[model samples]
Target chain A: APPTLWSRVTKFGSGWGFWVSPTVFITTTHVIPTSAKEFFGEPLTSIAIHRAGEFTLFRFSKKIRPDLTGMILEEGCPEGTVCSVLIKRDSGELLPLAVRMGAIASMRIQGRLVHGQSGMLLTGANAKGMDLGTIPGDCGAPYVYKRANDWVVCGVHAAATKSGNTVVCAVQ
Target chain B: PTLWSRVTKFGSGWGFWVSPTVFITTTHVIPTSAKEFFGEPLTSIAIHRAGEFTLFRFSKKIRPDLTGMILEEGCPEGTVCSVLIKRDSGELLPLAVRMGAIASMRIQGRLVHGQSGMLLTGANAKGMDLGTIPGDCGAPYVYKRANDWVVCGVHAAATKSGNTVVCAVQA
Candidate 1:
């Protein structure tokens, strides 16, 4: 099917992880560089997530930190049901997008696997067809679909397609 | 001027940092060394509390092992402290730790006694990792005595199986 409605196409810079509603924000599993040099060359333990044009730091709690990376949306969708995506352009602009969802398929980039991602993502395209995928820093961009009267999220952007269509992974 | 101008092959490997150059490790293990190289991978040797590191460099061979180096980088006669080094992206940095203690314990495969090396600890929380696979031999284990970074022991090995011990090199 084709996308119906969405209001924003957002982005979180550097490394991204956005709030789905209030608590559950989505991000990538390997963006933290395995063992980073923090606390004076000490092993990096946590990362900072972002939202609403601000930043929030989260920890890896004795490795409980490394366990939370990607989200599985099988639980359901956003609580608001109004698929409004956040907006922040590197050009210093805040453009919220109300977009429509479409057929989200899962596939491989080159038949080669992306490690933990087992065709685990969906895509974010427009009604006309334009992929809204992910990048080194675009891991938290979200995609939402409609269910009855509620606007439900499908997945978070994981990567970009060479052509049209952004690739997103399921969150519930 | 440079501290400990005698020892120079400085590099990092689960490594250690001498008061200036050089690191300590076990004679049994293998680590990155230079073709007579000095300083960390891409580090610039800045003077006293000045510049910093990549990995660690094997800076000196002075008084070789039995290991521990005395830097020529003139520290006060009675000051005590530890040197803190950092690496990120591609740059390395250095800081100082004030206040540390030194003692003695077992070494190598046998129940060896003192004089060979010393056990080092510190009051500063963020300096070096006290855990297994810490730093290397000839690596300086410094801490503060009062206002100076004191180089008391040198790390010659990470651990027996899960411990890195710092022993006093002939100062």
Candidate 2:
């Protein structure tokens, strides 16, 4: 088996999420209810909220298959880094969408100028960044970067630029 | 020396640093109020209007960490070259584009914008297929020679069909 990199991701509320540890799940706060205590029938536990970074950590009673954990990256992806944004197809398949130009710049979201330092801007090889807001369930998807033979999640899809660029909240 | 040490922000456009204190950029993007060349106060030294390139002199030599590159006077026609697109954060993205006819702009030994200068085509940067966007004006067009990448031109303007023309280096 090529190690189920995509299988690690699971639907968390309106968006998607993946396990960083046996019991901890990482996802964007905007996608899930802040008071969420259960996920996919998993029992309530605890929740850690980060409004500034726009991410939430949820601890659940049941463990996400051990194989799906241990992939969240704690480091920064330099500006201009080429990576993939994990997207879940309507067919229930998780695809690590190859993207280029990890520009760490400010984005204009819904008329608000989101500071560049607040999120990582992802654009495709064509130089246009994806706006997950257009695609339901894409928010909170993992912005995965392949390091060596291992894939790590460096960011969580946070919001979209009015012009369609995806602003991913840094995983760190 | 570092490769990009030869490239820096000059005025509203990008430019080439051929020497510690001497720089080159396109005349179109030259701003009158421009007084600094990436922290080194600068002043316009010369203008080759026919060539569409401008020369600048810095008050002092840049740090040794930055290095200058050679201005390839000889035409680099029909060769694969790299155009550096500088980001607002100072990160340089090198997009591979093919260089077209040097004679495309030459008329009576003078460079012409009609088809003159170095024509760069192909490659996609930020959705522009010309390997550069409008903001990349004054960006460096370089060619790898042996072990070093020499400056070929500075982005000047684009044709009606969208091909980018860089003001060729003459001196």
Candidate 3:
């Protein structure tokens, strides 16, 4: 699908989510409640929480605009990889940023793989360090990596260090 | 001499006045059902029919600001470009992205055709992403040349993965 100049990136709760297939959206599961059945005012059929990573999958009741679908990078990103972090502005706009890959690590509290589990670190800040967590509604953001001629969703933002580095949950 | 003075948010996208009465944006921004364009009243509109852009001849002459712009015949890859995004509060902020290759993309079953479109990535001089988005269509992709900011392309489309396609403007 061709990228539109100004297409809407779906906003849910206080974070962001994007289409993986025509009917499926991937995000940080914590942003949406399991009891909910809709997104952006549209009806959702189901929500699948992936415990291995920061991803939560939502299946919509109907297909969205065809152009909204994105490709997932199941293999995830490599260290030193520079990716674009796509976030929705509180003003209802979408913004992309250049961020470098940190390290992919396993995060667990009480031995459970949760929101911060299977995470990848992100650097590449405008200042010495710009903590992505400080920005409201940055959770569930997509980390887009550029392949040969395609852009793939490599990770989903779960949390950011106070030092300005971010942790994106792996898709793999 | 700022770029925003020449810019306008028309319909769902953004476009800038190339001349006092001429406006330019990509063809995709306007739907086929559109016969009347909002913002400035148009005397006539012409679309490429198969191309990525269109020209609007406005009924009224609206003077652009002091930041006069010219189209570049070709902008080399790695050129530093800037685009202004309209925030939710109606404030316009600048984002810098680097020019990538001029990719020939098949859009809606049609090829973008030759050097008509280019790719922009988040990696930039400022290291700030401010990458392009859907609503950024028609946002001016500008680069400094001598003392002027040349219009290299008009915001066209962007992938959630971060690559932006801009309709290249001819000199």
Candidate 4:
């Protein structure tokens, strides 16, 4: 289950395009920049975004941008903000990112979701440092939440460092 | 809801070679005879078959294959069968292919049951053949019994001709 819209709290960016919020983390694409081309290939675009509730299949939509690069972030919240989040299961960490609503900019890619061996980012600071640890075969992996008391996804660990120790980030 | 299996002898199919006898359908990808690669691909494979079910995640044990093209047949008796059919208002004709025991494999692609149809096949078969009439979509399609009606699946027009007089088939 995802947190209601009212439960969301916003934080100004501390640095590196990060926001402190409590929303359901979702990814447009499960893959990161390093292996995105191999996993998805060229001309493959868009990622699916899931909204809470409204489950007769229409609630899910796609985002088109091949890369989440250089797009201006929309300022000011809209009336009904629907988004995704990524939580860390091992550690009690929460990171949330806001997304554009409606189907105006969905990318049309030709693939399905991949499974296993994925890791998610826990803090907003961690998201900014994603490019540090992503590797060649780590795209489409899930950034899992691994907590003992309450398991919740904080954020999707989208990319890894060139040396394969750090990760690049994205909000759900 | 009508239990199609109780009244009829329909079963699901499974296995690597499209065993239509199991409850669930299995998919496989066989390389065409003409398209040869540098190395020879495995000629045969084995898979586990099961009854009606759905999956939440991808399973490594199950082989991945395309849908609709894989065909299974001659399912064993005592399995469950379900369909979706619809009916229209002010129409006297009953829904075709209601719940019942699957009689036999009439041919390579057809299955016969106890239900009756209007003309050569179903009530709308004649109208459909001449192109003078079209079957209504989204009617209250259900399984018919002597004393009561058991709601089945919704009804829709067949996408192809051979599949007429039947409810929705599994995808």
Candidate 5:
């Protein structure tokens, strides 16, 4: 069986993102911390993805900027119409968490204002990502979106929430 | 858990309806021997579409091969069908398959006549292996084909690579 569209979810520190262009991995910006402070806040640890019995360490060939980060892969990962969120549990098993396409909520910024240039915010748009429920480690998990039968980098798991639905910012 | 009209069960296995009346399933389940003369021994077929299951006692059975057979006077009206399971509590449950395109490429050399199928994807990498139970013989396989949903194959042999291998029963 081929992997679901959502199965492309890979890790970034403690966050998550899925494959968009084979080598270009997308995740939430805050998922990877540049310093110890970023780790304390985002818990920037763990760079490897475990599948079956193989554990491969993943790194961002690019930078985590403006709520987006990309990972480079030697080969492509599976992304399709029916994808699942892969979560590695405390037992060290990389399992797929259940989720569907689109959502009642969008993955906008936590606020309407961005710091760098303008008061830009990904908020107030239609849901490109999902956050029905999530955990701390699910930060950069990518939500594979099916567009015209193929996989497109639509949304990435950006924030963590316990009660409310998590948000996934659109591709930046 | 329930796959509605896309599936049916009778002779210790399952089968899928391709048209409003025609269905496809495995031959081993019905096993063609010198005894039947291509009779296609499935007597009854139950199909679940939306919520209710309409029963069909096969008045027509056409065989393409010992490994495959076709059915008529059974399938439902809905083009988008689902499979249902009869519960002991008398409730019919639906069976869902996350179907994809026809990836048939003639694997292991069995049903390669059509030379169509590619391979099964979508459910394997999720840590779920797609296999069939003993009674799951002759089950129908439904999938998305272009603008419409179609019955493209049957639950034939499986690879340890997850039951990703489905027999392209063809149209």
Candidate 6:
């Protein structure tokens, strides 16, 4: 296989997850759980966990705010599912920053990838034609194409319906 | 024929007055007034035994807000002072907008033609050579050198203190 997919995966779960729908790509392995053990080898205490669909609040830790020191995460997993992450920094003290994830729904228009609330896209199943008609939360699954050995992660899954059309939007 | 200095004078009791400063060439007249009165005509009123300044203001029925529209007359009769006017049409109304004015002033140091408010300088007037100084409030006055005329714009006035040279600071 000639590297058919480009994946940027991180074990540091600043409490975030993303997914795509079937209308975009055929996905398998529906869900993946977040665990500190998977990210860091040893169990770390005082690790903040952002539950899926929870709000993430952020704050500055020091009197003088530091520039260029922030984290970015995906908003929602499925097309209609909402996600959020709280951020904090270690400066001999603690500060909190929280943000809420919004739901991702499929769009009828044909595009390369499904972009979620955080402006990220989920794609990379096939180079040419692909089908999208499944529910949300099916992202992060292996999108296997016919006659192809490698698989790509489906961007997003359908979370909501609008205008009587089954729309599945995702991002890469 | 003997050519004598003709003095045209006017005064204001409590209001404002426009006075002619210099007449450059035969076409430009520099008048003195506020920056607000960049355009409009120079008129004279003869009511209440008052002079041209008060009479002009009264006859025009000018309000304080419209005072900036008036232009200053230049010296040496026959010099012209003119203002540029622009028309603006909005969704509901149409109005005239006075843009600016052009006139000539005395070639002295930092003295602008109109009033003491605006200043003109020659190039190198500030030892920079001959260049035109912007007449606006925040414009940096520059002096550029030209020919024998030392052709420079009036960038600023050289201040003297009681027959002594003193440092001048900008406000």
Best by DockQ: 3
With candidate 4 superimposed using the best TM-score fit, by how many Å does residue B20's alpha carbon deviate from the native? 45
Say what the RMSD of model 6 is: 28.8
Q: Score the docking of each candidate (DockQ).
A: 0.01, 0.02, 0.05, 0.01, 0.04, 0.00
User: Residue by residue across B75-133, what tens digits does model 6's lDDT show?
Assistant: 12221111110111100000011112332333344333321212111111221111121
Q: Residues B66-166, candidate 5: write the lDDT tens digits.
A: 23223322222222222222322222222233433334343444432221222323343332312233454454534233433344445555444443334
Candidate 1 vs. true structure, TM-score? 0.27
Per residue, candidate 1 scores C-alpha lDDT tens digits across B63-149 of 343334343222333333332222221111122222223334554554422122212222221212222233333334343333333
How does residue B158 of candidate 5 score in lDDT? 43
Candidate 4 segments exceeding 4 Å error: A1-25, A28-58, A61-134, B1-171
Task: Tell me the RMSD of model 5 versus the true structure.
Answer: 15.3
lDDT of 2 by residue, A92-138 (tens): 43334334445556666776554322332222112222211225467
| Decoy 3 TM-score against native | 0.44
Residue A171, candidate 5: alpha-carbon lDDT: 34
TM-score of candidate 5 chain B vs. the reference: 0.42
- What CAPRI-style quality would you assign to candidate 4? incorrect
TM-score, every prediction: 0.27, 0.44, 0.44, 0.17, 0.31, 0.17
RMSD of each: 21.4, 16.5, 11.7, 21.7, 15.3, 28.8
Candidate 5 chain A TM-score vs. reference chain A: 0.43
Docking class of 5: incorrect
Q: What's candidate 3's DockQ score?
A: 0.05
DockQ of 2: 0.02
Estimate candidate 6's alpha-carbon lDDT, on a 0 to 1 scale.
0.21
Task: Estimate, for each residue in A43-133, the C-alpha lDDT of model 1 and write its tens digit.
Answer: 4444444321111223332332222333334432423232323323344322222322333345555352332111211111111121122
TM-score of chain B of each: 0.35, 0.70, 0.70, 0.26, 0.42, 0.15
